[PDB]
Amino acid sequence: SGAIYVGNYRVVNRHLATHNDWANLVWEDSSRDLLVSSTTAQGCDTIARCDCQTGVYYCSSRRKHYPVSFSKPSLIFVEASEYYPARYQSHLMLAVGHSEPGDCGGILRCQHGVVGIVSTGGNGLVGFADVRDLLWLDEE
Numbered sequence: 676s677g678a679i680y681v682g683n684y685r686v687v688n689r690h691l692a693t694h695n696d697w698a699n700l701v702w703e704d705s706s707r708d709l710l711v712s713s714t715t716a717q718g719c720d721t722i723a724r725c726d727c728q729t730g731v732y733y734c735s736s737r738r739k740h741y742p743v744s745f746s747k748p749s750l751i752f753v754e755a756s757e758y759y760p761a762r763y764q765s766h767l768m769l770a771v772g773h774s775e776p777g778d779c780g781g782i783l784r785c786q787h788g789v790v791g792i793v794s795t796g797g798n799g800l801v802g803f804a805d806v807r808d809l810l811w812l813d814e815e
């Protein structure tokens with residue numbers, strides 16, 4: 676579980692979005708596993724606006740924060756899961772590290788701020804959904 680709170684926006688994995696998130700939908704993309712809903716209260720996270728490939732992510736199945744190197748956002752084939760069939764996932768970055776299904780929502784961050792959230796995993800790799808291209812997240 677896990678979310679990003681920026682301005683009047685809440686960023687979650689689309690597969691973990693609640694009834695409330697759907698009733699207050701701003702934007703969603705199934706191919707990216709991302710959903711953004713509106714909030715009453717203002718959030719304090721800052722989104723990074725950079726091309727960084729080094730950072731740290733949170734892993735709840737180990738209660739630990741891990742430093743990792745990751746690939747740039749890309750269109751990647753992903754095996755079937757409990758939430759999606761086997762398909763190409765877009766705007767996805769990969770790193771070598773531990774992850775389990777319940778780790779989804781854990782934040783990946785760099786020196787500039789939030790880079791993205793845990794979305795895929797398996798065979799000793801962890802996949803993160805990028806949010807650095809969504810410029811509108813800190814606008815309006």
Ligand SMILES: Cn1nc(C(=O)NCc2c[nH]cn2)c2ccccc21
Pocket residue numbers: 690708753755756757758759764774775776777778779793794795796797801
């Ligand atoms: C971190 N992690 N997440 C999942 C998962 O089920 N994500 C849902 C999802 C998103 N896109 C396609 N399927 C997983 C499974 C096995 C091991 C690690 C894992």
Ligand SMILES: [Zn+2]
Pocket residue numbers: 723724725726727785786787788
């Ligand atoms: Zn950065």
